[PDB]
Amino acid sequence: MKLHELKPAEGSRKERNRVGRGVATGNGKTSGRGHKGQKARSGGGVRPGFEGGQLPLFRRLPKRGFTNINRKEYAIVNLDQLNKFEDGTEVTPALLVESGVVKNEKSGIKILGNGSLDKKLTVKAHKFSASAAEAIDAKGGAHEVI
Template structure:
C-alpha cells in the first residue's frame, strides 16, 4: 500500500497541517448550573458526577465552568475552576477544593 510505481506517493505530496500535542491534558467540563441537582451540603467530586449521570468519562480531570447560577451550598472537588465558577460557589455558601493544592491559611 502506498507504492505508486516509483513516483512520489500521494501521501508525501500533500501538505501536512496542524499539530496535536500528545501530552495535553483533556478535562471534562461541568457548568455550575448542573450542580443544582445535588442535595444541599453534599460534597461533589468526580465520582459523584459520574454516579449522577452528569459525566460519562472523567478523562484527565474535571473543570468547573461558570455558566448558570448555583442556589445550593456545596463542597465542590475538581481539578480546576474558572474565576466566575469559584465566585458563584463561594457566594452560595459553598467551598471550592482542588486536590493537591494546599489550603490558604487565614491570618
C-alpha cells in the same frame, strides 16, 4: 396484532428504485447516466477531489500546525448541572459519575461558570474557572483543588 393482519407504520417503508427495466419508469435505457462520457461507463466516475488536472484545493492551500500527543482534556461540568444536588452536600468525581453527570473522567474534571447555581455546597475537583469559584463562594461553599 395478528400475523395475517400485519401493517407497518406509515412512512416507514418505501420500494427501491429498479433501474434498467423499461421506458415508462423514466430510468430505462441509460439508467440515469446520460449518453456517453467517463461517468456513463461501468466503474467510471472520477475520484473525489479530482478537478480535471487543475491543482486541487488541498494543494493550493498550505498546511499549518502540529498535534500535541500528550494533551490534557477535562470533563466539563457547569453550575446549572449542580442544581440537582442538595444543599450542604459534598460532591466528588465519583459522586458525579454515580449521578451520571460525567460519563468519562478524561484527565480530570473542570467546573465552568455558565449557568446559575442557586445552591450551597462544597466541591472537590482538579481545575476551576474563576467565575465558577466566585459563584460557589458567593452563595456559600468551598472549592478544594484535588
